[PDB]
Design an enzyme around this catalytic site. Structure first.
Site, PDB file in Angstrom:
ATOM      1  N   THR A 185       1.352   3.686   5.362  1.00 64.38           N
ATOM      2  CA  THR A 185       1.666   2.321   5.737  1.00 64.38           C
ATOM      3  C   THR A 185       1.423   1.332   4.612  1.00 64.38           C
ATOM      4  OG1 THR A 185      -0.589   2.149   6.611  1.00 64.38           O
ATOM      5  CG2 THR A 185       1.167   2.613   8.184  1.00 64.38           C
ATOM      6  N   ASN A 224      -8.615   0.320  -0.793  1.00 66.51           N
ATOM      7  CA  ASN A 224      -8.217  -0.365  -2.019  1.00 66.51           C
ATOM      8  C   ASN A 224      -9.122  -0.052  -3.197  1.00 66.51           C
ATOM      9  OD1 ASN A 224      -5.826  -1.701  -1.259  1.00 66.51           O
ATOM     10  ND2 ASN A 224      -7.003  -3.303  -0.243  1.00 66.51           N
ATOM     11  N   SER A 257       0.781  -1.239   0.000  1.00 66.88           N
ATOM     12  CA  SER A 257       0.000   0.000   0.000  1.00 66.88           C
ATOM     13  C   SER A 257       0.812   1.289   0.000  1.00 66.88           C
ATOM     14  CB  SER A 257      -0.992   0.022   1.165  1.00 66.88           C
ATOM     15  OG  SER A 257      -1.985  -0.978   1.010  1.00 66.88           O
ATOM     16  N   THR A 281       0.757  -3.241   4.427  1.00 68.25           N
ATOM     17  CA  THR A 281       0.800  -4.591   4.959  1.00 68.25           C
ATOM     18  C   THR A 281       0.694  -5.544   3.775  1.00 68.25           C
ATOM     19  OG1 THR A 281      -0.405  -3.817   6.919  1.00 68.25           O
ATOM     20  CG2 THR A 281      -0.243  -6.206   6.572  1.00 68.25           C
ATOM     21  N   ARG A 285       5.531  -5.482   6.193  1.00 66.52           N
ATOM     22  CA  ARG A 285       4.987  -4.362   6.953  1.00 66.52           C
ATOM     23  C   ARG A 285       5.863  -3.148   6.682  1.00 66.52           C
ATOM     24  NH1 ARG A 285       1.061  -1.639   8.383  1.00 66.52           N
ATOM     25  NH2 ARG A 285       0.171  -1.722  10.502  1.00 66.52           N
ATOM     26  N   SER A 341      -6.028   3.842   3.388  1.00 64.05           N
ATOM     27  CA  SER A 341      -5.497   2.771   2.554  1.00 64.05           C
ATOM     28  C   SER A 341      -6.609   2.035   1.801  1.00 64.05           C
ATOM     29  CB  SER A 341      -4.653   1.784   3.378  1.00 64.05           C
ATOM     30  OG  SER A 341      -3.598   1.287   2.584  1.00 64.05           O
TER      31      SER A 341
HETATM   32  C1  LIG Z   1      -1.780  -2.288   1.717  1.00 61.25           C
HETATM   33  O1  LIG Z   1      -0.646  -2.639   2.007  1.00 61.25           O
HETATM   34  C2  LIG Z   1      -2.967  -3.129   2.126  1.00 61.25           C
HETATM   35  C3  LIG Z   1      -3.756  -3.485   0.890  1.00 61.25           C
HETATM   36  C4  LIG Z   1      -2.797  -4.202  -0.024  1.00 61.25           C
HETATM   37  O2  LIG Z   1      -4.841  -4.348   1.241  1.00 61.25           O
HETATM   38  C5  LIG Z   1      -3.877  -2.292   2.980  1.00 61.25           C
HETATM   39  C6  LIG Z   1      -4.457  -3.109   4.129  1.00 61.25           C
HETATM   40  C7  LIG Z   1      -3.744  -2.493   5.300  1.00 61.25           C
HETATM   41  S1  LIG Z   1      -4.012  -3.031   6.851  1.00 61.25           S
HETATM   42  C8  LIG Z   1      -5.437  -4.063   6.716  1.00 61.25           C
HETATM   43  C9  LIG Z   1      -6.520  -3.520   7.638  1.00 61.25           C
HETATM   44  N1  LIG Z   1      -6.446  -2.081   7.443  1.00 61.25           N
HETATM   45  C10 LIG Z   1      -6.845  -1.296   8.342  1.00 61.25           C
HETATM   46  N2  LIG Z   1      -7.314  -1.746   9.421  1.00 61.25           N
HETATM   47  C11 LIG Z   1      -2.938  -1.512   4.894  1.00 61.25           C
HETATM   48  C12 LIG Z   1      -2.024  -0.693   5.663  1.00 61.25           C
HETATM   49  O3  LIG Z   1      -1.907   0.490   5.285  1.00 61.25           O
HETATM   50  O4  LIG Z   1      -1.398  -1.160   6.642  1.00 61.25           O
HETATM   51  N3  LIG Z   1      -3.036  -1.308   3.599  1.00 61.25           N
END
Ligand SMILES: *C(=O)[C@H]([C@@H](C)O)[C@H]1CC(SCCNC=N)=C(C(=O)O)N1
Ligand code: NA
Length: 267
Positions: free
Chosen positions: A212, A109, A46, A214, A220, A107
């Site tokens: 961020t 999608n 993300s 994940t 991470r 974040s």
């Molecule tokens: C990005 O890295 C992911 C995406 C690929 O699905 C999203 C999901 C999260 S965390 C999942 C739950 N989110 C919030 N409670 C992130 C993130 O920014 O950590 N991006």
């Protein structure tokens, strides 16, 4: 040596958490302050949503996009983790700016994919990286498959140094107008997803903004900027820790934040 302490402390985290930790810290001109595995490739996940928003702002600045343009969609655009997209679904659209803010701050999608549909897809995102001087970062897929993070896969990757330099270019290198630069900085500061990651490891008086990520397979990440008093820095942190729980991966990134802080304060 403060930089030796920095290296040693990151390597201790790596060894004890069975992790790989990529870090780059650069000054506003992209000059290296410190790093670790800084030219190793990691999945962006993300974190690319920050450069995506920069692309959108560049187009708004130029006039090739309008911030208030309504982007219509149906339930086909709802994918995993699309909180704002889901809320706006009945209304039938989100504006370019609403979608970009949701992508950056939640974040979201679906909102990210809505913007990707609009601006020319992964190929166009990659072209923007090249345009601002980043020959390393690449987007190949939309969300959430771009976050698959298959070991060894170079699709959808960056390096800590390439991304930190891209952040510096966007925020400090004149990529955006003063207005758009200020706005994206405020969006990063107000990010809702990073309370337990990098900024949790920084002093409470530093101005910090970040995005961020994940990924699957233990990814991470956290990228952004910090101002330590009057000094501005761009930073990119990418980690892989397959054996840790989600909470522990958050804590790992916060720990990296503390290691960065120790370096900045002691130098
Ligand atoms: C990005 O890295 C992911 C995406 C690929 O699905 C999203 C999901 C999260 S965390 C999942 C739950 N989110 C919030 N409670 C992130 C993130 O920014 O950590 N991006
Ligand atoms: Na649909």
């Amino acid at each position: 040596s403060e930089k030796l302490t920095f290296k040693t402390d990151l390597e201790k985290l790596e060894r004890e958490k069975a992790a790989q930790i990529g870090v780059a810290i650069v000054d506003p001109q992209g000059e290296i302050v410190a790093g670790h595995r800084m030219a190793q490739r990691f999945a962006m996940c993300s974190t690319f949503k920050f450069p995506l928003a920069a692309l959108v702002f560049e187009r708004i600045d130029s006039g090739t996009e309008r911030g208030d343009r309504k982007l219509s969609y149906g339930p086909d655009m709802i994918v995993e983790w699309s909180p704002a997209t889901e809320r706006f679904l009945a209304s039938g659209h989100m504006t370019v700016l609403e979608a970009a803010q949701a992508a950056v701050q939640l974040s979201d999608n679906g909102a990210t994919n809505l913007l990707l549909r609009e601006i020319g897809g992964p190929a166009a995102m990659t072209q923007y990286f090249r345009k601002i001087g980043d020959s390393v970062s690449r987007l190949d897929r939309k969300e959430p498959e771009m976050s698959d993070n298959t070991p060894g896969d170079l699709r959808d990757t960056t390096t800590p140094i390439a991304m930190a330099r891209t952040v510096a270019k966007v925020l400090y290198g004149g990529a955006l107008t003063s207005t758009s630069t200020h706005t994206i900085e405020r969006w990063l500061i107000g990010n809702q997803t990073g309370d337990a990651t990098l900024r949790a490891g920084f002093p409470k008086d530093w101005v910090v903004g970040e995005k961020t990520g994940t990924c699957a397979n233990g990814g991470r990440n956290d990228i952004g900027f910090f101002k330590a008093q009057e000094r501005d820095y761009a930073v990119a942190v990418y980690t892989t820790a397959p054996k840790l729980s989600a909470v522990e991966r958050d804590e790992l990134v916060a720990s990296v934040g503390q290691v960065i802080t120790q370096l900045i304060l002691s130098t």
